[PDB]
Amino acid sequence: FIKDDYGPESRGFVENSYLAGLTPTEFFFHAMGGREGLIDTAVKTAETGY
């Protein structure tokens, strides 16, 4: 992307559906959002346990 691009695509928002497939960038930003979900599961599991 170009520097300073708050427009919805360069910063987050994916246009496509899981059926259409995610463009490369869309794909990677999605993995960032999926990681939050993986990490939170592990961290939350320990703390509630205690």
Partner 1 sequence: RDGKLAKPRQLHNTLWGMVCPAETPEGHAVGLVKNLALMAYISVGSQPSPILEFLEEWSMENLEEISPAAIADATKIFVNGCWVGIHKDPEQLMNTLRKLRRQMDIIVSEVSMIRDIREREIRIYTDAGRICRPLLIVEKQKLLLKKRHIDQLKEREYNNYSWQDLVASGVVEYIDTLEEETVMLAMTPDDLQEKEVAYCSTYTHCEIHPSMILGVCASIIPFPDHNQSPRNTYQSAMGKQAMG
Residues that bind partner 1 (CB under 8 A): 2, 18-19, 21-22, 24-28, 30-39, 42-43, 46
Contact 22, 30 (CB under 8 A): yes
CB of residue 27 vs partner 1: minimum separation in angstroms? 5
CB of residue 35 vs partner 1: minimum separation in angstroms? 5
Three-class SS state of 13: coil
CB of residue 23 vs partner 1: minimum separation in angstroms? 8
Sign of CA dihedral 14, 15, 17, 21: negative
